[PDB]
Amino acid sequence: HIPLIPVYGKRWFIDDIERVEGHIAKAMDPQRLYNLQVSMLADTAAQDPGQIPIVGMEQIRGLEKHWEARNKKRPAFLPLREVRDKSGNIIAGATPAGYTQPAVMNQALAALLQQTSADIQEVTGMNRADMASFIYLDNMAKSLKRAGEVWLSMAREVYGSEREVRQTGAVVALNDLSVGRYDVTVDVGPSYTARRDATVSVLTNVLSSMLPTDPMRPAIQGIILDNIDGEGLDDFKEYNRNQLLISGIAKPRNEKEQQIVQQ
């Protein structure tokens, strides 16, 4: 086989062309429209922060220092003049003409902010089937199945055929042929670092579905404790194995116990 193993997120065949899709293609438009909304709001807000009074030039001339320091000193009042026309008549009062406006945040921008923020969560995501990661994890398994087939086809030319008359392979380097397809099936399962993990993981699933009764359960516990374990468990493990083999479950490995403790 060709030794390349493709992995797809979601794959379809539409018009003589294979089409793929990840998990972020569908959400590009709302995201990059949300960014624009925030960017446009920021500088509009920064353009006009507050309010400033508006006056005529000759309505305040000579009185600027009182208005300049109205927040430091504590004046009892502020003076100003009236608006007079070209012939000297009064047409307006001494109040300032008006004030500038602060920023406003138009309504359409607010609606777009809410809508796009809500749509991003909508587009992107029986217990397993309800989760959004099921299809990717399912497409990974069928890639691993093809990887197993390629490995098994390629392993015969490197490690040799197996045969049985134990499983003994070649002598120096050889393949053997016309031995036929093997009697195994490629599947997927949990990944384990060591064999002991694989043993204890299945044995503990066999357990915990058993009522406390029948010989079984002590034997399962003995087999489990025979595996596993780390630093400083030499005496405990030896004590376990002694009881495990005097009960006819361990099958002495023909070195010392078959003639010493078994006898």
């Binding site: 992995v7 997120g9 590009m28 991003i120 994890l137 197993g148 093997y182 399962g189």
Partner: protein, 195 residues
Amino acid sequence: MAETLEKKHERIMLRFDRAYSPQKEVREKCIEATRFARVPGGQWEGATAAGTKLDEQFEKYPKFEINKVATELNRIIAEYRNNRITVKFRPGDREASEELANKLNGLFRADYEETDGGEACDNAFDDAATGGFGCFRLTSMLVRQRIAIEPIYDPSRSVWFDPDAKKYDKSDALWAFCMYSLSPEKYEAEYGKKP
């Protein structure tokens, strides 16, 4: 017409262009998506330098970036890295198939652990979940022979198949390409001085 005679090389080059042309607009979306989600300034690419004169200057528009599409992707990737899954090799109904299966899936574990199997699978799944396409390789290295599992980087712009293969696993394919980048000094190391 082969080896030194380059008449094979024109056929190889023609096959490359025939494989590249159909899957050209599809891979652009994958690359754009990965870059959109991961590169720090990649959500505004296409505009970047855009602005107006503004009294004989070139002030550019502010372009803020608030990345909100990566959280669910990270959740999906964590879901796989918690439970990693591998090959099993179930037995059959025969006198000796049990030992055969045990030996086979011990050998596979040895090959997967003592080489770059974990990195290859993680990289492939990450790329597949982000852009939509991932890949990894299965070679045979000399250490006195061994099967090794290796990762492939940038699958979207590196792996090209026969345009006549239609199945998920590309079983019915007759040729393929695998591009990778290189440095001039490493090109001097092997492959000789060369042009």
